[PDB]
Amino acid sequence: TKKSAKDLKLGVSISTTNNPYFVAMKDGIDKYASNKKISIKVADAQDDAARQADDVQNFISQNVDAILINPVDSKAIVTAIKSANNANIPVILMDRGSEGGKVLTTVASDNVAAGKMAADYAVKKLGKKAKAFELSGVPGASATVDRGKGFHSVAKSKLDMLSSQSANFDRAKALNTTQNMIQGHKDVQIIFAQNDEMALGAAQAVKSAGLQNVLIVGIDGQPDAHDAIKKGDISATIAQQPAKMGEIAIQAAIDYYKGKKVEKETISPIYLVTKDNVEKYNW
Numbered sequence: 001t002k003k004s005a006k007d008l009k010l011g012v013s014i015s016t017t018n019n020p021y022f023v024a025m026k027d028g029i030d031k032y033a034s035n036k037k038i039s040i041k042v043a044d045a046q047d048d049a050a051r052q053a054d055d056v057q058n059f060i061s062q063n064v065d066a067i068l069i070n071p072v073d074s075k076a077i078v079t080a081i082k083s084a085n086n087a088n089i090p091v092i093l094m095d096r097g098s099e100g101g102k103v104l105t106t107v108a109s110d111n112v113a114a115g116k117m118a119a120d121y122a123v124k125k126l127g128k129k130a131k132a133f134e135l136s137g138v139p140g141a142s143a144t145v146d147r148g149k150g151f152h153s154v155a156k157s158k159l160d161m162l163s164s165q166s167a168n169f170d171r172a173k174a175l176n177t178t179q180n181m182i183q184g185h186k187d188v189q190i191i192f193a194q195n196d197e198m199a200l201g202a203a204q205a206v207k208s209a210g211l212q213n214v215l216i217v218g219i220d221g222q223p224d225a226h227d228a229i230k231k232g233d234i235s236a237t238i239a240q241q242p243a244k245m246g247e248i249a250i251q252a253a254i255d256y257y258k259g260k261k262v263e264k265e266t267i268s269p270i271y272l273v274t275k276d277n278v279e280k281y282n283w
């Protein structure tokens with residue numbers, strides 16, 4: 001099976017586009033696509049596991065040559081993956097994994113390591129036994145179970161947890177969640193958000209309650225998050241590479257149809273971004 005990279009039809013299923021991170025992914029994907037002459041159709045799922053399933057079959061009937069999927073639920077996507085497996089359409093996973101199904105390659109970070117660096121930053125900045133919140137994400141996404149595991153590794157010891165509720169990777173839900181979390185625990189010192197949308201939402205809740213020394217740590221490295229660090233609204237973020245993610249996914253589809261072997265796993269590098277680092281690792 002060797003098709004031409006020129007005029008290659010690819011489907012791209014992104015969970016939601018309300019998130020700047022997954023917008024940066026789309027934009028970097030289309031830039032790579034047009035640079036190597038790949039025809040591409042992106043389909044937003046709006047954090048729906050069923051709209052994604054229908055978005056997969058629409059690509060399947062579009063007769064695309066590969067489907068770049070960013071799952072919303074890592075368990076529910078498996079059924080649709082076997083559907084593309086039967087149609088002999090290679091599946092490439094991005095940012096989040098899946099619990100089963102035949103996948104050509106997976107491009108994503110070490111989300112366990114991402115949780116690692118956030119607790120390490122808190123313990124290194126605010127000492128040990130410091131009172132902290134966690135803002136978890138979509139419970140069915142592999143990125144939130146891994147970020148929570150890697151965080152609590154260095155958080156069972158060295159840190160005191162007041163709460164751990166989820167805001168589903170959403171600014172607004174995190175704003176409300178944080179505000180209520182503060183009401184109970186006025187003595188909070190650190191807030192860990194598994195994504196920058198929640199970090200930015202916690203920052204508004206912290207400053208609306210008049211708290212002045214609550215260190216905030218996020219994950220993604222989004223342009224606005226660099227700006228909050230300079231403005232002092234948050235303290236650090238764990239940078240990801242959303243564009244470089246979807247661009248080594250596209251090249252994997254090209255390399256597959258080129259008769260070249262592609263790695264089953266590709267770990268995207270992550271980086272800490274503090275007030276001294278704000279100029280680096282930007283998307």
Ligand SMILES: O[C@@H]1[C@H](O)[C@H](O)CO[C@H]1O
Pocket residue numbers: 019021022095096141143169194195196197219220240
């Ligand atoms: O890695 C991505 C980003 O952190 C985004 O903010 C939410 O979904 C995660 O999987």
